[PDB]
Design a protein around this ligand. Structure first.
Ligand code: COA
Ligand code: COA
Lengths: 288, 388, 388, 288
């Protein structure tokens, strides 16, 4: 396990919203310990059998939860995020997509100064297969195991999973950092955890065209992580300077290429997979 | 979103930044009228297109006479300019900038972006005016000075001085520059941009600083809170399809190959393309299905991808989904007919209802192929296409 | 130039007028999301197109659930809306407005224009709110009240009361109504508008006045000093043949016959058109040749004309000019070829060198007729087409 | 003659610029008593063998000129009609096209108020054949005569002219009143001037959609115009709500239609010609 476990008590911001609800449902069904939610104005009621509060402070006081998911729309996001930090959540996972870089940019800072953890945004979230769910992560594909994964992209991940799952492996925790250019947590931030997680026997690193992130990690990695890592990068055929769907996916000044990225890991001594379908495979090896 | 030179200038002005006197024309007549609104020749006439390399292209020229102007305009409005940064059939010229010629002592270089790596907006300058920095930096990397805005305080003057000196300016020039940096540093923040590029920042013989050119980019994500910007968008400048796509929560980007892809998720999409080329395929596009793969949605995709008569096959690849595998299948089928796709289709379903889906697919009778596994489908498509 | 409902609203806000809480959307998601930034609805969803009577057309709707909304939008974004004021080929819907519902107490009507006759800006108002005023006026003209802005003083408040009371308001409504009058009256002149029309201007149940709808028209001729609105223009709404034309300094206008006209002059043309029908024919377009009847210019003129494949001939009538009988015929020929116009073309060259040119035409060897007389030409072409 | 004659002295505003120059050579060549132009900042130079000033005022003095022509860009036009009124010109003729209505709307007022006269804008102008000319009118087609013309549109006018020449009549003066929604002097003003002109034996009035002056001209005429008149109107085939080249040439929610106009004229007992063609034809009739 890496960030969340079965003891993790959660709350939702924008709980009564649509996405909020749906998704809450499942977490709920999966056994995630949803302790309740926040929807300004709707304090006082119960949604999904859980209580609904007007403020995070409230919710926290009431439930002692310490994690929170946010289904709040771009424009209001930063507010909630601040709010949470402010209320003493230590872990945030914002799902929202459409977040003005400047906002995030200012937000990361606060996060840091404050010692809070946020995953995201515009990401599936996290699941510690077998104990805890957070995100649009789809339930039944995971198998409790020794694989650890980080990814900038959601769907891809699901591929991975499938494999490790069919390859017998199973996953410790699944981490979807989100695909915006400026995240709350990055490769490193996590890797570091994996490295220190007794249950994580090896890792799958996933990324695409975009920043340095990858590069940066290798570095770290090489000279900071012992467990074995298989890595893969999406975007080889990508065009220059075109946002490829995910906002943070774009080739800036002829910088941020698939290849670079690849090259860069292999150097750090990384098991690089040209083909996506090969993660199970590749692993096998490094995994034997 | 990109803006036009002219719009940029206009803003600079709104902010107090220095720029040439100019007028954006739409007809040769207005163009030819500006000259004497501007005064004494000779004047500068630039095509307002969103691409760079405008110069080399022939869309920027110094002129000596009213008529000379008429001409250029005549020559360009309506036509499509093509720069090295342009596509193939380029962009369309619909406006033309007419400004005053400038007295060029030096050429500097000013710009800002968001430094992912350092998670900051950094402004950077350099003495190497009138040249692409990607270059410059690529090789005289020490010719760039940088500074990073602090989020805590805004931007401060020391930072501007700083560079100014780093640039070796003196006197009022230094005062001036400060002014500008402060100037842009603010707009940046005020209007949620993503990027700025004054190249060249110029020094006039008369010894003043002035933004000969401007290039901006705004953060799509904040439009919702930048109505001015909002209004300024020039759809005329991008691939219309891309626009259609969005109208259906789709993320389209047109490519070069012959193989259509339609996938559920950006990650996948890329990876998927990638895997294909891997199997010798030539992806002809990137499509990312953002809504729920409903019928209309899939149908709409279809149209789009198919807009490019080049494509010879399509690869659908669905994995997660809020839609039942079987469900989608249906639509795809549906889709295939409604639209009328006369091209082979490879399909990679996954998730729920997956088998049922592939079957329905198959029993369909159409030219659809339920793919066994990812890499299978890959082959299959490359397959079918290569057939020719 | 006209403006989109959302566009006026924006303006009205910038002037401090009442209008409802609303957001303009360019995606279902978006639209779908406003519902809550808005609050409980139900709420209204409006397609945004320049034309009116969007209602009947079903381009408007009140709604009860996110889901519903999300549908409307799905339904219409990208499609054309066709109304009684559209063109058998509606206007294209690229946005939708999402706004709060309102409790309509009473619907008045408030609008204003430049009265050519009296030469003033006139504001008229009525209780016949909610109805096409043309009608009301035409049938019961005494239910309109008007005032004329005095150009010496500007809009005065006593005028605003006058109407408020004619409409029989009392209490605060009076003062509110007065407010707006001035509000609009100000924009009118400040923004160089040509028309305004709030239809309706309602009295809400809660007892206040709010501008439920809005339709502005801008003085084309003034854009030069009105950069804001310049940016608001939305070509999508118009015939693209129109702007193309303009960029050429052409005054093009799609009609419906099957005989095309290229005339030198607004006056001439319409007459021309007129004669044609007059002799049987039925023209398909208005064509004011703006610049010098220069090859290039003419060519386009043709290109544009011929975009309409229902056209089965071209009539060219050229009188004055700053060109020359011949130079002209040449250019015609030239045109004819290059364009590759397969249909018969008739020509009346006027005055200057006109004889030589006609000769030059009959000598060309294309399907060009040198109509002798004006009326003659007329005929010729009518046959030509009749010929079948 | 009407408004102008060989005696009339002219000076032009915007003289230096393009059109100004050109059109001038011509009036000049035709023998219009050009007398100088004005172009702020260019005073004290010569152009076309004429003296340039920096101010209507300067020049008016120095030349004793009484009517000016303007070829000044739309966005300055008003400081010009205006300035001229101030230098006490008695006859303004503004060619310019594109003036915002509101500007015109005020000017009209000043003009009235000052008792000055201006023709236009957005018009060909005027000329008193063999006598004098101002405007973009074209020469050799006119012939001194008894026909008086008025038109809200220029090209057409050429046709009439032509006709009236060909049938031998000729013309006193022809006036371009301009295509703007609100013009310096309308129908009646000029009409009136005609009825009182000895040289003019008859009238051709040319109108077009949008508006009502024609309508208004009728009645006027009817009860105030002795001489016989011939009227051709245009845009019968034109559509609602659409501008047809000329600015004031549109149909305001069902008003200012061509028949509507044609009628009106008939009642005032005018010779309605439905074919631009038989313009001369009809005269012959009445003009006998
Ligand atoms: C965040 C997002 C999902 C919201 O979608 P949604 O659930 O349909 O939104 P809704 O309006 O439906 O509901 C959101 C709720 O936020 C609530 N809310 C708003 N501001 C809030 C705040 N500061 N704190 C708490 N809740 C807040 C609203 O009141 C609303 O609930 P309601 O309707 O009771 O009142 C949307 O911006 C989004 O989808 N972003 C990205 C989507 C995506 O593609 N994700 C995948 C990538 S990880
Ligand atoms: C006004 C108009 C005629 C300009 O024509 P243009 O000659 O191309 O414009 P140019 O810039 O060459 O010349 C205009 C001159 O006005 C001068 N000018 C500007 N402001 C002035 C002022 N207040 N007073 C006098 N002159 C002025 C300019 O200096 C310029 O001359 P310059 O070169 O010496 O500076 C234009 O609005 C037009 O063509 N309108 C309609 C034309 C038409 O179709 N007419 C027939 C139908 S009515």
């Amino acid at each position: 396990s890496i960030l969340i476990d079965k003891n993790t008590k959660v709350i939702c911001q924008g709980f009564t919203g649509s996405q909020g609800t749906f998704h809450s449902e499942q977490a709920i069904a999966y056994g995630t310990k949803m302790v309740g939610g926040v929807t300004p104005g709707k304090g006082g009621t119960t949604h999904l059998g859980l209580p609904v509060f007007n403020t995070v402070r409230e919710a926290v006081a009431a439930t002692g939860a310490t994690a929170s998911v946010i289904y709040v729309p771009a424009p209001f996001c930063k507010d909630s995020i601040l709010e949470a930090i402010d209320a003493g959540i230590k872990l945030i996972i914002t799902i929202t997509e459409g977040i003005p870089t400047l906002d995030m940019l200012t937000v990361k800072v606060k996060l840091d100064e404050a010692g809070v953890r946020m995953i995201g945004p515009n990401c599936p979230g996290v699941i510690t297969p077998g104990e805890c769910k957070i995100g649009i992560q789809p339930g039944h594909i995971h198998k409790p195991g020794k694989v650890g994964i980080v990814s900038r992209s959601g769907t891809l991940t699901y591929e991975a999973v499938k494999q490790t799952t069919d390859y017998g492996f199973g996953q410790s925790t699944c981490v979807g950092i989100g695909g915006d250019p400026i995240p709350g947590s990055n490769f490193i931030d996590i890797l570091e955890m994996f490295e220190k997680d007794p249950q994580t026997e090896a890792i799958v690193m996933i990324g695409e065209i975009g920043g340095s992130a990858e590069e940066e990690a290798a570095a770290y990695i090489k000279e900071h992580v012992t467990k074995p890592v298989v890595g893969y990068i999406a975007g080889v055929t990508a065009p220059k300077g075109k946002r490829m769907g995910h906002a943070g996916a774009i080739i800036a000044g002829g910088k941020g290429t698939a290849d670079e990225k690849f090259a860069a890991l292999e150097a750090a001594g990384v098991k690089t997979v040209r083909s996506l379908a090969d993660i199970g495979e590749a692993l096998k090896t490094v995994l034997k | 979103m990109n803006l036009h030179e002219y719009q940029a200038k206009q803003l600079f002005a709104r902010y107090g930044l220095p720029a040439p006197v100019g007028y954006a024309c739409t007809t040769p007549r207005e163009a030819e009228e500006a000259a004497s609104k501007i005064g004494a020749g000779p004047w500068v006439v630039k095509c307002q297109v969103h691409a760079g390399g405008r110069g080399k292209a022939g869309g920027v020229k110094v002129v000596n006479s009213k008529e000379d102007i008429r001409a250029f305009a005549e020559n360009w409005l309506g036509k499509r300019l093509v720069t090295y940064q342009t596509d193939a059939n380029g962009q369309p010229v619909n406006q033309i900038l007419v400004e005053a010629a400038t007295d060029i002592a030096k050429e500097l270089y000013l710009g800002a972006v968001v430094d992912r790596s350092s998670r900051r907006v950094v402004f950077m300058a350099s003495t190497e005016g009138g040249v692409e920095i990607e270059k410059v930096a690529e090789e005289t990397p020490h010719l760039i000075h940088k500074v990073a805005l602090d989020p805590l305080t805004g931007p401060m003057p020391y930072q501007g001085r700083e560079l100014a000196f780093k640039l070796g300016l003196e006197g009022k020039l230094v005062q001036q520059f400060t002014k500008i940096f402060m100037g842009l540093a603010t707009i940046f923040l005020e209007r949620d941009l993503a990027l700025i590029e004054i190249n060249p920042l110029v020094i006039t013989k008369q010894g003043d600083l002035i933004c000969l050119d401007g290039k901006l980019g705004a953060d799509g994500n904040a439009l919702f809170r930048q109505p001015d910007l909002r209004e300024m968008r020039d759809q005329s400048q991008e691939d219309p399809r891309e626009a259609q796509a969005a109208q259906w929560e789709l993320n389209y980007v047109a490519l070069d190959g012959n193989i259509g892809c339609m996938v559920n998720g950006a990650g996948l999409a890329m990876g998927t393309m990638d895997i294909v080329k891997l199997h010798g395929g030539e992806p002809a596009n990137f499509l990312d299905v953002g809504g729920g793969a409903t019928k209309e949605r899939v149908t709409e995709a279809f149209k789009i991808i198919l807009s490019d008569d080049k494509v010879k096959a399509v690869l659908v690849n669905i994995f997660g989904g809020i839609v039942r595998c079987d469900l989608i299948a249906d639509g795809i089928i549906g889709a295939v007919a409604e639209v009328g796709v006369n091209v082979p289709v490879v399909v990679r379903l996954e998730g729920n209802n997956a088998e049922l889906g592939a079957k329905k697919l198959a029993d369909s009778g159409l030219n659809i192929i339920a793919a066994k596994g990812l890499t299978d489908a890959a082959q299959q498509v490359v397959a079918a296409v290569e057939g020719k």
